[PDB]
Amino acid sequence: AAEISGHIVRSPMVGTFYRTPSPDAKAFIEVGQKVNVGDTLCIVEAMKMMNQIEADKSGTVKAILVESGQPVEFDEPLVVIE
C-alpha cells in the first residue's frame, strides 16, 4: 500500500534536509507543530544553499523520515506532516 501519505517534503532534488536554522536553536519544525500555508517548514539545502520550504496546505508534522542535516536524493521523504 503506497498511498494515504499525510504530507511529507521528500527532497525535491538531490539536496539536504535540515531542521535547525541556528546552531543549537529551536529547530525549524518538530513533530507536534501544526504548519499552515505560508509557514516555513525546513531547509532543503539543494547543491549547498538552503531552500526553505513554505507550507502549501497547512498540516501537522508527524515525523522526520530523514535525519536532521544530511544530503538526500529526489523523492527522499524527510519531514512528514499529517
CA distance 27 to 60: 15
Residue 9, CA distances (Å) to 4, 23, 45 in order = 14, 22, 13
**Structural domains of the chain sorted by starting position, each given as residue range(s) with its CATH number in brackets:** 1-82 (2.40.50.100)
11: closest CA among 45, 58, 34?
Answer: 45
Using the Cα atoms of residue 80, residue 56, residue 32 and residue 45 in order, give the sign of their dihedral.
positive
Residue 12, CA distances (Å) to 4, 23, 33 in order = 19, 24, 22
The H-assigned helical ranges of 21-72 are: none
